[PDB]
Amino acid sequence: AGKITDKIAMLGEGGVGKTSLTVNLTKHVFSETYDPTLEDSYRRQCVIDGIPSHLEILDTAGALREQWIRQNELFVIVFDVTRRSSFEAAERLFEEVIQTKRKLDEPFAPSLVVLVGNKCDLDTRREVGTLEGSSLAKKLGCGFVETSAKLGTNVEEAFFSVVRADRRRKR
Numbered sequence: 001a002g003k004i005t006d007k008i009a010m011l012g013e014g015g016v017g018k019t020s021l022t023v024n025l026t027k028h029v030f031s032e033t034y035d036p037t038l039e040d041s042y043r044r045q046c047v048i049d050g051i052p053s054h055l056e057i058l059d060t061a062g063a064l065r066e067q068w069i070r071q072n073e074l075f076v077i078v079f080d081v082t083r084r085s086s087f088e089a090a091e092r093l094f095e096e097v098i099q100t101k102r103k104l105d106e107p108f109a110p111s112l113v114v115l116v117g118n119k120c121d122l123d124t125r126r127e128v129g130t131l132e133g134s135s136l137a138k139k140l141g142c143g144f145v146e147t148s149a150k151l152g153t154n155v156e157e158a159f160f161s162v163v164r165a166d167r168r169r170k171r
């Protein structure tokens, strides 16, 4: 009891909100500003749908990305809804995840990934639409959640989504 139950990796281009999301989720003491030059691994003890869970989240920032993928079970791929280039990278990153997980499996499934459209509080400046993010995720077989690390909006839903999916798979 109390041990790490799930290993999640953050992926996404710089500036999309990876660190901010993780610090928000884990209720870190300087929730608004904590951002060390060298990324940390973060922990959240929680109860997800009645089951006590302990998430270990790898914050990150090609070959090194492959190590991050081998050493984690679930994935949160973040893009910035105000930056279409970040959305394009996220799609590329999803393919890296699948291909890498395919290598090891010889199983991993796209539902163990969630695409996160962050900075949704910046609605008046979005370059990527909600329906567009939703349709990409549907095309790929993965989750899609819109979040605001700044306001905390939908942050838990985003992270817990991949745990929920993993459990859904067992039956």
Ligand SMILES: Nc1nc2c(ncn2[C@@H]2O[C@H](COP(=O)(O)OP(=O)(O)O)[C@@H](O)[C@H]2O)c(=O)[nH]1
Pocket (backbone or CB within 6 Å): 012, 013, 014, 015, 016, 017, 018, 019, 020, 021, 035, 061, 118, 119, 120, 121, 122, 147, 148, 149, 150, 151
């Ligand atoms: N308005 C807004 N700004 C955000 C949000 N998430 C992150 N930021 C800002 O985006 C910048 C980069 O955030 P950071 O967490 O360091 O991104 P990272 O490089 O992916 O880890 C910082 O100035 C954050 O304050 C959000 O949800 N809304």
Ligand SMILES: [Mg+2]
Pocket (backbone or CB within 6 Å): 018, 019, 020, 059, 060, 061
């Ligand atoms: Mg960061």
Ligand SMILES: [Mg+2]
Pocket (backbone or CB within 6 Å): 036, 038, 039, 040
């Ligand atoms: Mg550290």
